[PDB]
Symmetry: C2
């Protein structure tokens, strides 16, 4: 299995590529692409790590040699209209070289960039709405972290389902669906506030010198490794991700997803919410509906 990382020279890409090189199953392939000329040396750097994952790096404007034979393409490129244009460019190169690969969108805003990728794939005739994901894992592992410390549990065993979007009030952690724990509304309100503002938390703490990179690479790695496991035949792999579903909420919506050999195999029900969980649900569906149309207007 071959994984391509677009934008691998950035903070997120290098962290993601380091975890993939050390955690992808033996025999896997890892290709790194980024416009930055340093990218072929990022792969040589990683290639000195003694794991059974071959890795090669590519630079320049053409991403084709890195996408040839790619089964999964993770895109953390860019640094709104410059990032939207870069997303559109790279999805074009993917549709030309690896049209049936699974595509995980990391470049933000996810709510809008996934819509851009969808329209680019449709205009190419190679669109599979089961193979395009918006990577929202960071909200989940953030929720897991915050919940575990408040309630004194093992952080690695907490799993909070997060649904909706990847921006602000569109991020909805389903804290009522976490087993063995209850929360006061004072805790439901505060946790939902921090999870939807945790991105700002790292922005302020970095002295205006960057966004979340290492935790995002960790979250992107979790999603990529789950995807590879399910693509390789493992059963019962479920991750919450931002996909094009039934339209019951928006054209693009993040919910728990059963992953399979062809990307998504079942978009799981969101369960049954608390009262506040559907107040925050319906109370943002146009804020998510507007983010999607912004992505479809950009292409045409």
């Amino acid at each position: 299995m071959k994984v391509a990382v677009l934008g691998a020279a950035g903070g997120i890409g290098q962290a993601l590529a380091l975890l993939l090189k050390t955690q992808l199953p033996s025999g896997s392939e890892l290709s790194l692409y980024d416009i930055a000329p340093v990218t072929p040396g990022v792969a040589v750097d990683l290639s000195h790590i003694p794991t059974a994952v071959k890795i090669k790096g590519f630079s320049g404007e053409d991403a084709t040699p890195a996408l040839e034979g790619a089964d999964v393409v993770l895109i953390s490129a860019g640094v709104f209209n410059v990032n939207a244009g870069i997303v559109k460019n790279l999805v074009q190169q993917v549709a030309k070289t690896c049209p049936k690969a699974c595509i995980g969108i990391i470049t933000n805003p996810v709510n809008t960039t996934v819509a851009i990728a969808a329209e680019v794939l449709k205009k190419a005739g190679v669109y599979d709405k089961n193979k395009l994901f918006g990577v929202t894992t960071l909200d989940i592992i953030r929720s897991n972290t915050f919940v575990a410390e408040l309630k004194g549990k093992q952080p690695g065993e907490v799993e909070v389902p997060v649904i909706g979007g990847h921006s602000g009030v569109t991020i909805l952690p389903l804290l009522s669906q976490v087993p063995g724990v209850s929360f006061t509304e004072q805790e439901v309100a505060d946790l939902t506030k921090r999870i939807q503002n945790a991105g700002t938390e790292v922005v302020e703490a970095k002295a205006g010198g960057g966004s979340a990179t290492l935790s995002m690479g960790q979250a992107a790695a979790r999603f990529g490794l789950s995807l590879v496991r399910a693509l390789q035949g493992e059963q019962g792999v479920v991750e919450c991700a931002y996909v094009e579903g039934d339209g019951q909420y928006a054209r693009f919506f993040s919910q728990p997803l059963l992953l399979g050999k062809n990307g998504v195999e079942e978009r799981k029900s969101i369960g049954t919410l608390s009262a506040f969980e559907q107040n925050a649900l319906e109370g943002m569906l146009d804020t998510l509906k507007k983010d999607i149309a912004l992505g479809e207007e950009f292409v045409n």
Copy 2:
């Protein structure tokens, strides 16, 4: 168990802190320091990862709060890599930085184990040792030069040449951490054999493996992610030994019995107070014998250069 990472805002430091945050034992402590103002957010970034490892980051020129109660100090500050000058551009840049931080270590966490990542390691460890002595707290069993990058590189290249699984190959590397001071004991890799051509070519590559990365990074970057991995392996092995695990062996640059030089890399049995026992380098090939004696007085000039700087 509290681990302090000095220089945590750099490429090596950020990759190191990322691996430590996920692989350190549950209940461990991680403190990040770097003069760069981004360092507190580097820890807040890592703090959002659901592992039982608490983390906080500090900036300014005072590393005291990060070193407070530290059991291990990993220093990858300054310009910890890579090929500049013959190696003396880095010395003049990093010598004062290593001296500053090791000084702060000796007056806040003098009992902590110290791992020096900042290069030139052959010389920066001598700076650290002498600085700890004049502070009156020098423990020869608690000061290491991190040479693990040479080992995992040799594991990679040997597993590649001999068609073996990369995680199953372990190559002992002795001597120093630069050029001809890097001696991989290919004659001790269990279950494989090499030719003279392979020994000389593999050694040559391992001794200059940093140039593979520099010229590939378009001349504008060093080995950062592989170094963070190598430093993580060394730190995790040290922490395991510090928590009571027995049989933890890692090759690293320490002050030994001076059979070859005052400081020398060799297999080290690690214990609850740092170095438990300095193991013998075993029987050497004729090639490894020639390589050893042919590199000692340049290793000694490396050590002498660092001693002169502190007095």
